[PDB]
Amino acid sequence: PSLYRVLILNDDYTPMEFVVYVLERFFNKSREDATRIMLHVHQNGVGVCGVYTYEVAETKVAQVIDSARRHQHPLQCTMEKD
Ligand SMILES: [Mg+2]
Numbered sequence: 001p002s003l004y005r006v007l008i009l010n011d012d013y014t015p016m017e018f019v020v021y022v023l024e025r026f027f028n029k030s031r032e033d034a035t036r037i038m039l040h041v042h043q044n045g046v047g048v049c050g051v052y053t054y055e056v057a058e059t060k061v062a063q064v065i066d067s068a069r070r071h072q073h074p075l076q077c078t079m080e081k082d
């Protein structure tokens with residue numbers, strides 16, 4: 001039962017608030033944690049949102065893209081074997 005990391009990539013145009021909204025909503029973070037991960041990514045260029053089983057991980061990558069495309073932001077999100 002291998003696991004997979006769900007990451008988001010930093011870009012220069014996506015609002016800070018939407019990134020915080022995303023983590024709170026799709027990754028189940030309190031607003032303190034959300035703020036941390038968002039700030040971390042902003043400086044590091046990449047950050048782990050969470051770690052799940054493959055398909056759980058897969059659903060979360062898809063929901064972040066589908067969501068990002070509706071707010072019309074270019075937030076990049078993908079996965080990788082933990
Ligand atoms: Mg390990």
